[PDB]
Amino acid sequence: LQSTLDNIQSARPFDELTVDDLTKIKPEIDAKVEEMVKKGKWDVPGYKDRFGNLNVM
Amino acid sequence: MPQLVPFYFMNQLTYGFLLMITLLILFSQFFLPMILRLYVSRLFISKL
Amino acid sequence: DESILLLTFLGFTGLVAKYLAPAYKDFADARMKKVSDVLNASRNKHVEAVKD
Amino acid sequence: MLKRFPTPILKVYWPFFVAGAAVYYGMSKAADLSSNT
Amino acid sequence: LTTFSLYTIIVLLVITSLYTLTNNNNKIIGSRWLISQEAIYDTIMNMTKGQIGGKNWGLYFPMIFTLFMFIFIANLISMIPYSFALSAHLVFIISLSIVIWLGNTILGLYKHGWVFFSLFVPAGTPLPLVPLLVIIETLSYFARAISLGLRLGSNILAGHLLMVILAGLTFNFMLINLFTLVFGFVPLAMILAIMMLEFAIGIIQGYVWAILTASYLKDAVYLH
Amino acid sequence: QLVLAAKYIGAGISTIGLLGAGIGIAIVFAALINGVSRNPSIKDTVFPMAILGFALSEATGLFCLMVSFLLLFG
Amino acid sequence: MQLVLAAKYIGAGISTIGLLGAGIGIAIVFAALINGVSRNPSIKDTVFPMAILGFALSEATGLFCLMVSFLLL
Amino acid sequence: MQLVLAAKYIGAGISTIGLLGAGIGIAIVFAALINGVSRNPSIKDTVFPMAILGFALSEATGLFCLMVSFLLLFG
Amino acid sequence: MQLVLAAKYIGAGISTIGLLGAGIGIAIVFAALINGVSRNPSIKDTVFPMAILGFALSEATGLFCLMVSFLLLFG
Amino acid sequence: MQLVLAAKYIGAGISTIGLLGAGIGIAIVFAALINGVSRNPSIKDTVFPMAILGFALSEATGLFCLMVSFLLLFG
Amino acid sequence: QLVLAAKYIGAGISTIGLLGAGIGIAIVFAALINGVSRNPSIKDTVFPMAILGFALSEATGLFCLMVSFLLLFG
């Protein structure tokens, strides 16, 4: 747990990072993106529930 | 009126339809899934 | 004739630099901030759990 | 960033593309007919 | 080649730049420039989810996105003072419209058989006026064929033509003796107001095309 | 050349048909704003209904415009 | 010759004017639909068939004008 | 000669104008139907035959215009 | 000849008549906006975009007429 | 010549007709302004700038029409 | 000769534009009377706005009229 805290201390993006690095550490990223393109969706469920939905009307 | 008639119609339409098919594929395979990468990455951060 | 169109376009860019460029700066900034804050909040959220 | 993710909806856009070919051909003939006017 | 061909190339390269190098460091927070193409993404997600339901809306989401973006970009580029129109070449816009109308009709026939023709009885009515309501439904269905294109084409063309005619007129207005060149700015300002309007109706038309052919796809996907 | 003159006249007359549709379009949208302001919540159902109505009203105007073009091109 | 062919084109132009009435008519039906539905809420499903019928009849007047244009052409 | 043929066509075109008022009229009767049914919730059974009656009478005016248009057109 | 150049000018004049319907139309949308906003107060967040949309389309009908006027006159 | 010069004046006269619609348009906007303000006593601070937009836009249709009248008249 | 005749005819046609303003003024004044009769007391604020509206409505008719004089004299 000391190590886990330390692991979070020396790496923690919230400044900016490549989307490639999040893809690299979690290939779950590419799995979900591919599954959504395959499914015929372009809505990411939950994205709109804590990020905007940028529309006026 | 003849002013809205060029005879270059087929020239216009050829380059025109080439641009549409190009933009359609370009969005569909590349740039639309590249936005979906931002969204999905944001949601994974949301989970963690 | 066609130089009039260029003068109006220059005037249009004048309105843009007056009104739109700071507004769009503020708009872009606002959204970017909100995203950043959500992301950092989630990072915070898991750090708390480790401590628990 | 840019990575190709297959969109299998390019083959769902088959009725659109068939229509496109017909109009493309038809405008060739229309251009030839209008240049004889 | 042709002037038209040269500006179609410019459109392709502009659209490429909006995703290729909008970001610096491929941000997870999103660049300030990329906020624009996020808002566009979200309002068209919510627009074609707004019209067509199912998970089938995402199946037509690129089609509605490139019909948005083409018209959105081509009603900014075509408004540049010396840039050579692609939208005032109506033959490209109208041909695309006829293509989409046929590609809706073919899709509807393919997906929904000869009960596609149930689209043209859109309500139970007295039996002697069941056929009347087929005739003037089919009439209105290929009025949709030309309406979608011709609306956009006329607006953009009219904008350029209005602006150029008044520009040519205001040159000779300033040529009138100098007491007329005092208050020679008031027509120049009018041309500016018109140029502003052409952008407005150009962004609105990009939405109007894409909502109307979202409505037409709603009709095509779900009968009636 | 009387025919050519006349073609230009017939076309001019054709614009008159468009005026009615121009008003019509505004009336549909007026109704939209009115309905929505009265109900609030009706808007999500009504906005699609409105878009359909816009197209139908527009189509009459399209016919008037098309006849103008038919004359214009001859 | 010249006068008769000329007259056909002119007469056709006049016929378009008749369509305008239908254009206004159709708008009135849809306006009424929106007003009725916003007033009631729940009426809409009953009203929508009535509206389609009313739309058709309004359009029909314009159609008569349109076919007369075709006769002149 | 030419003038007489021309005149027949002109008169036909002019007559087409008459129909427009009937067009607007038909809509007005139906607008009232919609508003009435939404107003009452229940007027519809009495009012629907009334609406048809009003429609028919309004329509008939346009029909008269139309037959005169044909009469001038064909001679 | 004299007649043809004249006919361009005359035909254009007639074409300009079409614009009046759009002009009144635009005002009707803005009236509805003002009425709506005063009626609800707070509807405006949805409705102001709707009204601008309605403005545009009313205007567009006018532009069709305008472009035809130019087409006859200027060629 | 005489016919072409004549056609400038006649064509201009016909063109002047379109202006009436913009006049009515402005009246509708101001009527709505009054109507809204009388309901609320207090909508006005929002509604007055909205009304100026409506005025300008309706007026613009008139100015386009007036331009065409001048193009026919003056050349 | 024909040019003189044409300008008199054209002057007539242009006068029709005034028609809209004559209606227009009344629509503003009607709303004034309706508003003040509704409120009993809006009038102090509303009356300036109403006079602004009157002037503008009339002004469009005056554009028609100055064109009418440009035809009539010219």
Numbering used by the authors:
A (entry chain V): 117 to 173
B (entry chain Z): 1 to 48
C (entry chain U): 54 to 105
D (entry chain Y): 1 to 37
E (entry chain T): 26 to 249
F (entry chain 6), K (entry chain 3): 2 to 75
G (entry chain 7): 1 to 73
H (entry chain 8), I (entry chain 5), J (entry chain 4): 1 to 75
What does the literature reporting this entry say, word for word?
ATP synthases use a transmembrane electrochemical proton motive force (pmf) to generate adenosine triphosphate (ATP) from adenosine diphosphate (ADP) and inorganic phosphate (Pi). ATP synthases are macromolecular machines consisting of an ATP-hydrolysis-driven F1 motor and a proton-translocation-driven FO motor. The F1 and FO motors oppose each other’s action on a shared rotor subcomplex and are held stationary relative to each other by a peripheral stalk. In Saccharomyces cerevisiae, the FO region contains subunits a, e, f, g, i/j, k, 8, part of subunit b, and the c10-ring of the rotor, while the F1 region includes a trimer of catalytic subunit αβ pairs and subunits γ, δ, and ε from the rotor.
